[PDB]
């Protein structure tokens, strides 16, 4: 139910924006949270950020200075922004939904994910 | 024989015998902003 | 808390039990008294799916072959009878303490 | 001459609580806050923004720790026959006690201010259904929080879940615990080694010679599910019974079945563990146990005389 | 920056109670009252006298009914490097308990 | 027979059952100037 | 140097007195009967 939208080709040292469209839940219910995850090609999954229904955003400390996650419930979407793009960040980005509000398991439903490559 | 629980005054009676309760007064007074005002709105012009 | 999933590659003949172990630098115990360590599986060209949550609970739609155990800083996924469809990458992920992290993940091989 | 002294209390934003105070041990010298539907900013000493250290407060008897940045109020420099304004911003941190009562949907601080939120509001497993009176953006639960004592300046190793709320006046923070295993509507009051239980007249009489007290209960057990927030009774009763049995009756008696629960007149919940020799509502409790004591007394004497006189009768007869 | 917030509670005159609030359900937007032995008038929103409706106050748990006219504090329009004063009058009506001994 | 003194709630328990106590609140609040401020100093300029 | 804490309910002591009084009487009176019986 979580869509993935993002520039497939971004030049180095530029801002990147993404988008995750929901279905069957709104980021306005008392216990919804949505997280953005990254996986470099052939490397392990890497958690980046997650936002709660109340604009409580949590980032990865290494990438804290660059990531910026925002939510717009009117369009029912989450926008993940990552400034200063770096060819090391060429990877597949996933959008996940968390039931820590309701269940002890997080990241049940994943989007298909979008591959973003950093090159000129 | 059965002895039923008997008492002249309960805790509720003794506590309410106070003309004012500081807790109740403060509880009702500090909701003044929540009730008769809007905390969150910011008007900038 | 950093998760260390071992071994990195686990070649296992079908029908034989398989073991994955990951360790954290610090206890993943939360103030709830629960350890939110969960195992996810990513199949080739597919979005990863949750297998096990809270160490020893199997997610809905997961067969009994997968079983988690452990505590403190050590945790172990055990597959009693590996099958053909068990091929993929396995991750152990801690959610108790922000920041969250995945292990290095282990790739299953069938011999 | 003082022509007016506007004294206000402003909350400290989260990004200043976590990044500055808890991490560096310093606090900003400017207070930027919304008051009376207007975003005001106050600069310390009418000067530029600065990071100021938090030093321990002066010692007062029977008071918790406190830290503050500025100790002297700043007043305007003298100019002849001119009204002049002077600002003083003092960043204060106080460890306080907080108290809540049933249904624990709002709690109080030791300063007499209220925070209109359940102490157990949170993010995990229904911890967001607890009552809240503030906007959702005023709350922030930092999971895995490393408290740094501002005196010893040492970071705590074990993380804790820290709720933070920015009320219009101040900002409270407290460790988060689940509601169900923390509160209880019943308190363990007494531990009775020898509670003799008898059945009579469709009622159970529990008599304790140690404290001289007799309770009367209906024949049926008490449904423990009926007690609101009754998660503590089982644990406390089990632990107490196990300790007490180990202390006294291990070598002579054995437990008989699971501990039973009965309700005694006046609102006393008795957990009873029978022994054999080797051969959703809230209960209101009366404030005076005396009646029960009387009963036991009236029982005791009565029983004895109803024995002795009876023997005399027989002794007379023969 | 706020340089001072004088907050006071003025009484509602009788003729403003029976004629206006109890009858028409509205309250005047100017508070005229005696304070510190001087007759003072506060005009809401620095404007003309007006009749304003009494709408119910926001709901609070275990609280009696309440009504008010204004929901936002009025603050002066921004003027560079000047002290500016802004008046706000909120007519409040509250059912309360009274206890005597 | 010996009757040990038995009571359901003490004075301390009943007094602490109160959510707030005016005395303690005022006591702590009026020390604010002594703790987080310096009463004695005078600065003239 | 310690400050003594006093219970708020004198009733127990009163109970004791009552239980003493009756008891003493019957412990003295019944006893007579016993003697009077035996003889």
Numbering used by the authors:
A (entry chain F): 22 to 141
B (entry chain B), F (entry chain A): 675 to 719
C (entry chain G): 21 to 131
D (entry chain C): 173 to 451, 486 to 524
E (entry chain A): 173 to 273
G (entry chain B): 486 to 524
Task: Provide the authors' original text about this structure.
Glycoprotein B plays a crucial role in the viral entry process and is indispensable for HSV replication and pathogenesis. Similar to the humanized antibody HDIT101, which we have previously employed in clinical phase I and II trials, HDIT102 targets domain I of the fusion protein gB of HSV-1 and HSV-2. Domain I is part of the outermost exposure on the gB surface in the prefusion conformation and contributes to the structural rearrangements that gB undergoes during the fusion process, making it an attractive target for antibody therapy. To determine the exact epitopes of HDIT101 and HDIT102 in gB, we solved the cryo-EM co-structures of Fab bound to HSV-1F or HSV-2G recombinant gB ectodomain in post-fusion conformation at resolutions of 3.12Å to 3.45Å.
We have solved here for the first time the cryoEM structure of the HSV-2 gB ectodomain in complex with two different Fabs binding to domain I at a resolution between 3.1–3.5Å. The procedure for one of the complexes is described in more detail here: Recombinant HSV-2G gB ectodomain and HDIT101 Fab were mixed in a ratio of 1 to 3.5. The remaining 234′096 particles were subjected to Bayesian particle polishing, CTF and aberration refinement, and a final high-resolution 3D refinement, which resulted in a final map with an overall resolution of 3.45 Å according to the gold standard Fourier shell correlation (FSC) at FSC = 0.143. HSV-2 gB Y295 made polar contact with a distance of 2.8Å with HDIT101 HC CDR2 N54 and D56. HSV-2 gB E297 made polar contact with HDIT101 LC CDR1 Y32 and gB D315 with gB R296 and HDIT101 LC CDR1 H30a, thereby positioning R296 in proximity to HDIT101 LC CDR1 H30a, LC CDR1 Y32, LC CDR3 W96 and HC CDR3 Y97. We next analyzed 451 HSV-1 and 368 HSV-2 full-length gB DNA sequences retrieved by nucleotide BLAST (NCBI) and found that HSV-1/2 R304/R296, Y303/Y295, E305/E297, H308/H300 and D323/D315 were conserved to 100%, suggesting that the HDIT101 targeted gB region is not under natural selection pressure neither in HSV-1 nor in HSV-2.
